[PDB]
Structures are given as structure tokens and as C-alpha cells.
Amino acid sequence: MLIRYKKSFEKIAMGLLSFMPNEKDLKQLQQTIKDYETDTDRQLFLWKEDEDIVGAIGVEKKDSEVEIRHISVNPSHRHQGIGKQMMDALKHLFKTQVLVPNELTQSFFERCQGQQDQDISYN
Numbered sequence: 627m628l629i630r631y632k633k634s635f636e637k638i639a640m641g642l643l644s645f646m647p648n649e650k651d652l653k654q655l656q657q658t659i660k661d662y663e664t665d666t667d668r669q670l671f672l673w674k675e676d677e678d679i680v681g682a683i684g685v686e687k688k689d690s691e692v693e694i695r696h697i698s699v700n701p702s703h704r705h706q707g708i709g710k711q712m713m714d715a716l717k718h719l720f721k722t723q724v725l726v727p728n729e730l731t732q733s734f735f736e737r738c739q740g741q742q743d744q745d746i747s748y749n
């Protein structure tokens with residue numbers, strides 16, 4: 627499930643966000659984590675499979691659109707649908723505004739939109 631970021635998860639949040647291509651070193655990591663903590667328009671979320679944090683997704687609220695900036699899943703948990711479940715839970719969470727990506731996560735975002743939601747059908 628999707629939970630808000632807490633300071634007690636800084637070590638795992640930095641480790642997860644380190645897989646983002648624009649996060650080269652650790653000095654830059656703690657600066658972006660400090661942005662998610664101290665900036666109102668920027669919020670970071672964590673995906674808790676069972677009781678272990680395996681994914682992370684952070685957004686920036688900008689007037690009418692909610693831009694996705696960072697999305698990362700633990701490599702040992704990839705290819706399990708966690709990446710799309712985070713966005714789906716994010717879309718339900720931000721039902722008020724429209725969910726758009728930036729140039730950093732446009733590739734994986736367009737893949738999920740092209741995907742078909744696997745739903746049951748009756749009659």
C-alpha cells in the first residue's frame with residue numbers, strides 16, 4: 627500500500643531514489659529528500675509490500691496538474707506490477723487533479739497508460 631514519507635525511512639528512501647538516473651551521488655540524494663520534507667508542493671510516497679518498503683514515488687503539485695518526478699522500485703521486486711500499482715494508487719489519491727509526468731519519468735508513465743487494466747466482467 628501507498629504511505630506518506632516519514633523521517634524514519636530516510637535510509638531506504640535515499641537508497642530507492644538512488645536508482646533514478648539523475649541521482650548520481652549521495653550528496654544530491656539528501657538534498658532532494660530535504661526538498662520533499664521542507665517543500666509543501668512536493669510530497670514523497672513509499673510502497674509497503676507486506677512490511678518492507680520496496681518502492682518510492684514522489685510528485686510535485688502544480689496548480690492544476692500533479693507532476694511525477696521520481697519513481698523507483700527495488701530491483702529485487704521489479705517486474706511484479708509494483709511500479710504500476712503505485713501509479714494506480716497515486717491516481718486514486720490525486721483524483722482531484724490530472725496526473726502528468728516530467729521528462730524524467732515519461733517513458734514508464736506512457737507504458738502504464740497504454741496498458742489495459744485487467745478487470746473482471748459480468749453478464
Ligand SMILES: CC(C)(COP(=O)(O)OP(=O)(O)OC[C@H]1O[C@@H](n2cnc3c(N)ncnc32)[C@H](O)[C@@H]1OP(=O)(O)O)[C@@H](O)C(=O)NCCC(=O)NCCS
Nearest residue numbers: 645697698699704705706707708709710730731733734737
Ligand atoms: C521503472 C521502474 C520504477 C518500474 O518498476 P516495476 O516494478 O518493474 O514496474 P511494473 O512491474 O509494473 O512493469 C514492468 C514493465 O515496465 C518496463 N519498464 C521498466 N523500466 C522502464 C522504463 N524506464 N521505461 C519504460 N518501461 C520500463 C519493463 O520493461 C517492464 O515491461 P515488460 O512487462 O514488457 O517486461 C523500475 O524499473 C525501476 O526502478 N527503474 C530504475 C530507473 C527508473 O526508475 N527510471 C524512471 C522510469 S522512466
